[PDB]
Design a protein around this ligand. Structure first.
Ligand code: RUT
Ligand code: U5P
Length: 454
């Protein structure tokens, strides 16, 4: 029998988009989806609803919290330092969430972050499903019970080693472990420290789920299932679905002028601003390769326009071979275009998948975020599908020569490391796109959800 599932993702494009890709996959199999979204954001989401008779949006009013910009709904509307306030706002939707569950009565609700939800759902006879679209390797490394019990004894040297029983080995740099140690105790909404929230979600939910497949994410999902004693499901890799909006002709025309495989595409998401020094090193590094490039970047900290912040003489040198641009673009459609030979990525979970299923060579430039960093290590050192840009051990900064080097290595047909990551990327692409991989992931997924509501 078909299920009725409610979706309550975090207020961010990086969560709304994959939750919507998955809803389309579930509705194709006959399940009804009640999709809770911020009110104004719904306009941007309609293009992705491929089953409007089965997927219904229910808007939420993102309540004012002191310090939150007027009308702000998602992390694309506020600086990264204001994320905790937006979380306080999402906590404050509790009243409209209880009303929606009462009227719609789903059997399951997929959610992020809101650890007060399982109490509500069990009182209504609803099952709570904490559904992550980030890497289970990340949750495993930072939020398994062994880390939580040290409480305030957890320090930078502690986070250079995996927790007890962690299934794989990789090395973090000193500045990365320092990031993890300080950010985990920062309050993220309603006075709750970041890792304590999440741990509460993992502890109190009925079941846990992750984007991913057994062949990549399995070892981490197994570890989490033994640690928390409840089912940890895999949805399959959530392959991007086709939008009902074709590629903007301005970009199609401009991309179409380059020879196949020659363009470097660089994008670091929609949540972060580089510092001006690193903004310059990145762009000068791209220029040094001599390849055409398209860089999708916010203006650096302190600056409001790209043109203000460009290195001196930059526009006059690169001419028509390079564009630096600030707006939201159709990244999935760009990564599909045959001009793109190389993808310089911040290693966000969605961008990782979008790169893996395409032909571009991957250059990994993770920004300061636990999932980004761990994605980059796995991609660079375990799957070996891309080349990571060298950063200073203690300061976390790169040179333009390190950017130039990484792109040159993967674009050089005769370079053996470039050839090796190409071959490894093809192997991973062939697995993710295998005719029965996602379908049999979802087969198991839906069976296990059926068990959950039984
Ligand atoms: C400022 C950032 O704040 C925190 O991340 C905030 C970000 O979490 C990301 O999603 C994340 C979640 C997460 C995801 C969904 C959930 O339901 C949930 O309970 C947790 O958990 C993490 C746990 C970690 O130990 C480290 C992380 O980097 C993340 C993370 O990035 C979101 O995609 C972003 O939109 C959000 O801005 C972390 O401390 C991070 O390291 C730090 O750089
Ligand atoms: O200009 C942009 C910036 C980001 N994205 C999309 O936003 C998501 C960012 O997720 P993540 O890579 O941060 O996880 C991805 O689906 C990415 O394709 C766009 O479509 N356009």
């Amino acid at each position: 029998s078909s299920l009725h599932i409610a979706m309550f993702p975090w207020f961010a494009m990086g969560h709304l988009i994959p939750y919507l890709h998955l809803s389309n996959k579930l509705a194709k199999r006959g399940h009804k989806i009640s999709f809770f979204t911020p009110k104004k954001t719904q306009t941007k989401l309609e293009q992705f609803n491929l089953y409007p008779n089965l997927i219904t949006f229910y808007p939420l009013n993102v309540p004012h919290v002191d310090g939150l910009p007027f009308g702000a709904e998602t992390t694309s509307d506020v600086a990264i330092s204001l994320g905790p306030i937006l979380m306080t706002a999402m906590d404050q939707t509790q009243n409209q969430i209880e009303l929606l569950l009462t009227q719609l009565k789903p059997q399951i609700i997929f959610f992020d972050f809101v650890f007060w939800l399982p109490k509500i759902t069990q009182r209504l006879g609803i099952k709570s499903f904490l559904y992550f679209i980030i890497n289970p390797a990340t949750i495993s490394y930072t939020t398994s019970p062994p880390r939580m019990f040290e409480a305030e004894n957890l320090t930078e040297v502690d986070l250079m080693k995996p927790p007890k029983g962690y299934p794989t080995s990789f090395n973090l740099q000193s500045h990365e472990a320092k990031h993890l140690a300080s950010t985990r105790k920062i309050e993220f909404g309603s006075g709750i420290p970041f890792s304590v929230r999440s741990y509460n979600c993992l502890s109190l939910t009925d079941a846990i789920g992750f984007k991913g497949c057994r062949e990549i994410e399995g070892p981490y999902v197994d570890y989490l299932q033994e640690q928390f004693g409840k089912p940890v499901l895999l949805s399959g890799p959530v392959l991007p679905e086709q939008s009902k909006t074709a590629l903007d002709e301005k970009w199609g025309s401009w991309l179409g002028g380059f020879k196949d495989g020659s363009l470097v595409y660089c994008a670091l998401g929609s949540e972060l601003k580089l510092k001006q020094d690193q903004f310059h090193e990145l762009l000068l590094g791209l220029e040094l390769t001599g390849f055409p490039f398209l860089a999708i970047l916010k203006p650096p900290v302190g600056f409001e326009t790209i043109e203000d912040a460009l290195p001196e003489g930059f526009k006059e040198r690169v001419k028509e071979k390079g564009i630096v641009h600030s707006g939201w673009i159709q990244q999935q459609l760009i990564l599909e275009h045959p001009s793109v030979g190389c993808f310089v990525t911040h290693c966000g979970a969605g961008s990782i998948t979008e790169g893996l299923v395409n032909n571009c060579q991957m250059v990994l430039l993770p920004q300061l975020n636990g999932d980004y960093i761990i994605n980059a290590r796995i991609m660079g050192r375990h799957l070996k599908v891309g080349v990571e840009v060298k950063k200073g051990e203690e300061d976390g900064l790169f040179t333009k020569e390190s950017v130039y080097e990484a792109v040159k290595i993967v674009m050089d047909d005769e370079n053996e490391i470039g050839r090796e990551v190409r071959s490894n990327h093809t192997k991973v692409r062939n697995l993710l796109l295998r005719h029965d991989l996602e379908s049999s992931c979802l087969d198991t997924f839906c069976e296990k959800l059926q068990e959950l509501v039984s």
